[PDB]
Amino acid sequence: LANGTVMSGSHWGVFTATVENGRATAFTPWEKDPHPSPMLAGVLDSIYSPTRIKYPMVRREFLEKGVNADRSTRGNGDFVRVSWDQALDLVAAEVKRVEETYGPSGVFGGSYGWKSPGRLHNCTTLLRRMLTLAGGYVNGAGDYSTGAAQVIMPHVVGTLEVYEQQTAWPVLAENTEVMVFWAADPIKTSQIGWVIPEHGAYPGLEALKAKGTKVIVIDPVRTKTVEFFGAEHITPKPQTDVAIMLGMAHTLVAEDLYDKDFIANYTSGFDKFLPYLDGETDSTPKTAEWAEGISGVPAETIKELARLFESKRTMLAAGWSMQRMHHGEQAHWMLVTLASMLGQIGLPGGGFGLSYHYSGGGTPSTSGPALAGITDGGKGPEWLAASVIPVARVVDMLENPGAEFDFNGTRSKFPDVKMAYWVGGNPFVHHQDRNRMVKAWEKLETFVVHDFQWTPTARHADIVLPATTSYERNDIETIGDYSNTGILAMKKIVEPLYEARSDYDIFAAVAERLGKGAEFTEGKDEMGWIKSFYDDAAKQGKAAGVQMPAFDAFWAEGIVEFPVTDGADFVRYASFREDPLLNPLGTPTGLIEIYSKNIEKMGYDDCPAHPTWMEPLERLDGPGAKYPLHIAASHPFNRLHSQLNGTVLREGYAVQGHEPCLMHPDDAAARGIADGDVVRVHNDRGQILTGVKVTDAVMKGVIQIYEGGWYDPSDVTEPGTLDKYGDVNVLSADIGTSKLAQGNCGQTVLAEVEKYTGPAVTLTGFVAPKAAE
Ligand SMILES: NC1=NC(=O)C2=N[C@H]3C(S)=C(SO)[C@@H](COP(=O)(O)OP(=O)(O)OC[C@H]4O[C@@H](n5cnc6c(=O)[nH]c(N)nc65)[C@H](O)[C@@H]4O)O[C@H]3NC2=N1
Numbered sequence: 079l080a081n082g083t084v085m086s087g088s089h090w091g092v093f094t095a096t097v098e099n100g101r102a103t104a105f106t107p108w109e110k111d112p113h114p115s116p117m118l119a120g121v122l123d124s125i126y127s128p129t130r131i132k133y134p135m136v137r138r139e140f141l142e143k144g145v146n147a148d149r150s151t152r153g154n155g156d157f158v159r160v161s162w163d164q165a166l167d168l169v170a171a172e173v174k175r176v177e178e179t180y181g182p183s184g185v186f187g188g189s190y191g192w193k194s195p196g197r198l199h200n201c202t203t204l205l206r207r208m209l210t211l212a213g214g215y216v217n218g219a220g221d222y223s224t225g226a227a228q229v230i231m232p233h234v235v236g237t238l239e240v241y242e243q244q245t246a247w248p249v250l251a252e253n254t255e256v257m258v259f260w261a262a263d264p265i266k267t268s269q270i271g272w273v274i275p276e277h278g279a280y281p282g283l284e285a286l287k288a289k290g291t292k293v294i295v296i297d298p299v300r301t302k303t304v305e306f307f308g309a310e311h312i313t314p315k316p317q318t319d320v321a322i323m324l325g326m327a328h329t330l331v332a333e334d335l336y337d338k339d340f341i342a343n344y345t346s347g348f349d350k351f352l353p354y355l356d357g358e359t360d361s362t363p364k365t366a367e368w369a370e371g372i373s374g375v376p377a378e379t380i381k382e383l384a385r386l387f388e389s390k391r392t393m394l395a396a397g398w399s400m401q402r403m404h405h406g407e408q409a410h411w412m413l414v415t416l417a418s419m420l421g422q423i424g425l426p427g428g429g430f431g432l433s434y435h436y437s438g439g440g441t442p443s444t445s446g447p448a449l450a451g452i453t454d455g456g457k458g459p460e461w462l463a464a465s466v467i468p469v470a471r472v473v474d475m476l477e478n479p480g481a482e483f484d485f486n487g488t489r490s491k492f493p494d495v496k497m498a499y500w501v502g503g504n505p506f507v508h509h510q511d512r513n514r515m516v517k518a519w520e521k522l523e524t525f526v527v528h529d530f531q532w533t534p535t536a537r538h539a540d541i542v543l544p545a546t547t548s549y550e551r552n553d554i555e556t557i558g559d560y561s562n563t564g565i566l567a568m569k570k571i572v573e574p575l576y577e578a579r580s581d582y583d584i585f586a587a588v589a590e591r592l593g594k595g596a597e598f599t600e601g602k603d604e605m606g607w608i609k610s611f612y613d614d615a616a617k618q619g620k621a622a623g624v625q626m627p628a629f630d631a632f633w634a635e636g637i638v639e640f641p642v643t644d645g646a647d648f649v650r651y652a653s654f655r656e657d658p659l660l661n662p663l664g665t666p667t668g669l670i671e672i673y674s675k676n677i678e679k680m681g682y683d684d685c686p687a688h689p690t691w692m693e694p695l696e697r698l699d700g701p702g703a704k705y706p707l708h709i710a711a712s713h714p715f716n717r718l719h720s721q722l723n724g725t726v727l728r729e730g731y732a733v734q735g736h737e738p739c740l741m742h743p744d745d746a747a748a749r750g751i752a753d754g755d756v757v758r759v760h761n762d763r764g765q766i767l768t769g770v771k772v773t774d775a776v777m778k779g780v781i782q783i784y785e786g787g788w789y790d791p792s793d794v795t796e797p798g799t800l801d802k803y804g805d806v807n808v809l810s811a812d813i814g815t816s817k818l819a820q821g822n823c824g825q826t827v828l829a830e831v832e833k834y835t836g837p838a839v840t841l842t843g844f845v846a847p848k849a850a851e
């Protein structure tokens with residue numbers, strides 16, 4: 079049995095593992111990581127926790143009746159252990175049956191999910207590689223993070239914008255006077271990366287504090303970002319930011335302070351927005367006082383912020399929760415409109431940025447080469463690659479096969495899907511309106527899942543296959559989504575546990591049974607694939623003047639780092655500002671479009687041709703709103719979505735075993751609720767249990783229940799059954815942001831809370847199904 083140390087990486091950072099007698103016993107942060115994540119201990123625990131999946135399993139009803147099975151019992155845990163050979167024969171036969179009977183339109187292979195980093199063991203790309211060989215599949219477009227913003231931005235500034243490099247952190251330290259975090263908590267969300275994170279935001283934030291820059295945070299919650307800077311904290315009722323921005327804009331026009339020259343030379347359509355802002359079109363001037371009535375933020379505060387932003391070099395750093403809501407396209411469109419009025423776009427330290435809270439945006443880019451990995455059979459964000467539906471319309475598709483839907487000016491039809499194959503994702507936690515979804519999933523004949531933890535998604539599968547973690551195999555990956563700091567060897571730490579197999583090995587075996595083995599593997603093995611990716615990067619590096627060692631020398635060192643040349647001076651939009659005729663934006667006019675003729679032509683009632691305030695489905699203190707509290711259903715501090723819920727880390731935040739619910743003292747007192755009580759949170763769509771922590775960190779009228787809790791239904795056959803653990807998507811609605819983007823509205827949620835006085839409940843989500851032990 080092995081003893082020693084091994085370096086590898088994850089979505090949480092680079093680390094060194096201590097191995098004792100073949101078992102990993104500790105993960106220590108990389109010495110060069112400026113700010114390691116406390117979640118590292120949970121990553122290690124996830125390899126061995128009680129919810130680790132040991133063996134391949136088939137749902138008893140499916141085993142016995144196939145397509146004639148009772149599908150309402152999916153998720154009850156009645157599984158049968160089978161041999162790998164049995165399982166693989168069955169998966170291959172079902173993939174082939176569905177392809178022959180229903181065509182490529184019958185197989186949904188979108189499989190949205192955060193998986194693990196790695197250019198070779200990329201489970202969702204490996205899935206599509208196999209499905210391509212089987213005949214084809216239906217894919218998903220966009221993502222749950224910026225579903226609205228990523229579609230409206232190309233019509234406004236010409237490009238995606240949310241996944242692009244930001245003005246560098248050091249430029250902000252030397253030039254910014256006022257830093258605004260608008261619906262962003264960079265301290266919380268900078269802990270992880272899509273590829274390995276370098277944690278570059280932490281040094282950048284520390285430099286702003288040491289410089290004494292004024293920081294303002296606009297968020298309903300008093301976060302660690304507020305606490306780190308001792309920031310001026312503005313607390314708007316959730317979903318009212320657009321009203322606040324309009325009041326600011328109206329103030330700038332009324333006091334004649336806005337930058338008329340910037341508007342004249344770099345934007346288009348301000349004259350069509352002005353009449354709306356002044357109330358000529360609807361008899362409602364969008365004043366600060368009007369904005370106060372909707373948002374609850376004092377009119378004088380709105381006016382003072384507007385004046386301050388106009389007189390100082392200001393950076394508006396906005397997060398994505400405010401577009402993960404009904405009419406979400408309006409939030410960042412209005413933010414860019416406000417930024418245009420301020421006139422600092424393209425100046426060092428001024429303007430706006432939509433990725434300072436995500437995967438190190440702003441950390442200086444190096445001059446190193448790009449690393450490529452296995453493909454599905456064929457250059458931007460890898461997940462953005464009737465064959466395609468907007469990702470959040472998956473349940474609408476299941477309920478309405480053949481029906482039409484709108485998307486970015488086109489009309490398409492939903493395909494008629496009969497099977498879904500999910501790897502590296504957890505839709506039974508990430509998707510909205512759980513009770514609707516539970517019923518909709520009965521439309522599928524067959525549901526196959528691969529994972530290494532017994533998530534709610536794996537519990538609901540017909541066929542579950544145990545995957546390995548990254549720590550039981552070898553791989554290669556980039557350090558830094560934007561910085562490109564280096565390339566890491568993700569070395570094997572321990573042998574595969576139980577009967578777990580890599581997703582690559584599973585799909586290769588399924589491809590073999592379809593008669594397409596060599597087409598899937600390309601005759602290469604694990605290390606042959608990894609060397610081919612490295613060799614390609616090195617060849618590209620050589621041409622650019624970056625020297626890189628030979629493959630075995632790189633593997634022996636475990637990492638290669640690249641040099642920073644001019645990356646620290648990057649200023650976004652500087653060339654556009656310098657010469658807009660030589661360097662125009664990718665819009666129809668070449669300028670920032672405040673009014674879009676293109677969008678006007680679409681004629682969508684829920685996405686007008688300029689930024690507009692519209693009432694959402696439900697909002698805190700909205701006219702005729704049924705429920706009294708808004709749920710800030712945001713990203714977890716001590717999980718990566720659902721990942722790590724079934725680990726030792728849960729002990730640090732669970733309240734009486736349930737997901738925590740933060741509640742203001744006055745809201746708790748009105749309901750006779752005390753700190754630590756178990757409470758039932760409910761609305762017309764569902765009911766869940768959570769454990770309360772009383773704090774004035776959350777503003778009055780708002781409760782915080784993070785997304786990612788492992789749904790643990792009392793009885794799967796009972797419609798609307800109580801969730802015993804606390805999955806906040808039991809309460810959200812499943813609707814599109816608008817006809818333009820069809821994004822998810824996971825943070826448009828109102829509910830009521832009462833002390834739970836019902837029968838005691840037993841938690842079953844954190845131990846494996848009895849038959850799987
Ligand atoms: N109400 C909501 N509010 C929200 O704010 C919210 N966030 C969105 C967003 S923004 C996202 S991500 O753009 C999704 C995340 O859902 P996802 O299914 O990616 O969640 P994870 O908990 O990270 O599931 C990953 C899944 O994959 C398994 N896994 C890891 N490595 C491997 C591997 O190598 N091989 C396999 N077979 N499986 C692997 C993990 O174990 C894990 O289970 O959430 C939205 N919802 C929101 N709602």
Ligand SMILES: NC1=NC(=O)C2=N[C@H]3C(S)=C(S)[C@@H](COP(=O)(O)OP(=O)(O)OC[C@H]4O[C@@H](n5cnc6c(=O)[nH]c(N)nc65)[C@H](O)[C@@H]4O)O[C@H]3NC2=N1
Pocket residue numbers: 222223224260261262263266267268269270296297298299301314315316317318319396397398399400402435436710711712713714715716717718719825
């Ligand atoms: N630790 C951690 N866990 C994760 O799960 C995680 N996920 C990653 C992913 S995939 C993404 S997409 C990003 C998400 O990055 P994103 O900016 O979407 O993060 P959220 O936690 O949903 O919301 C950020 C802040 O918005 C505030 N907020 C909510 N509603 C409103 C509102 O109406 N108005 C205003 N002004 N503020 C509001 C919340 O209180 C929260 O503090 O984080 C990434 N980083 C992550 N880090």
Ligand SMILES: [Mo+4]
Pocket residue numbers: 221222223224
């Ligand atoms: Mo996301």
